[PDB]
Curated annotation (Swiss-Prot):
Alphabetized UniProt keyword annotations: Carbohydrate metabolism, Cellulose degradation, Glycoprotein, Glycosidase, Hydrolase, Polysaccharide degradation, Repeat, Signal, Sporulation
Similarity comment text for this entry: Belongs to the glycosyl hydrolase 9 (cellulase E) family.
Span covered, complete protein: 555 to 705 of 705
Name listed for the protein in its UniProt record: Endoglucanase
One GO CC term, this protein: extracellular region
Any single GO BP term: spore germination
Domain of life: Eukaryota
Lineage: Eukaryota, Amoebozoa, Evosea, Eumycetozoa, Dictyostelia
Record function comment: May digest the spore cell wall during germination, to release the enclosed amoeba.
Gene Ontology molecular function, alphabetical: cellulase activity; cellulose binding
Gene that this sequence comes from: celA
Amino acid sequence: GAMGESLSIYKSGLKNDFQDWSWGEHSLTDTTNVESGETNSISFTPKAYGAVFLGCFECIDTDTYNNIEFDINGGSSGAQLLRITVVKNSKSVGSKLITDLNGGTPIEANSWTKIKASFIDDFKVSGKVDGIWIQDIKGDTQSTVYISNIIATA
């Protein structure tokens, strides 16, 4: 009813027709660091500017969902340097630093952090969005991160 809409993208596996277009090293079925109540996470070892990229052509209309959200675990080290990018019209149209999205704090090691980004507020993007990616920006290898509960929200 009046409860705002949500669209799951990954909840212990891909949902709602989203597609794995990732080019970095990752697994969609990591079972070593899972949130309570889930069975799998995406594991991602950020390196060589790889990224986890979840795609669904024009599936997210900002007239229905204001934000993109995910839970991230910083693994052994935390504090990974990552860029979160939104894709519209088959091109990247906006990016944000994960530390920025986390209020200026580097993501904590060994524990799960909610990451919220607003399409208009954070990416200055509106209309139909084709996907989101989480990209390594260090090149040099970073400790493995875990991603869970990817969801589009009003």
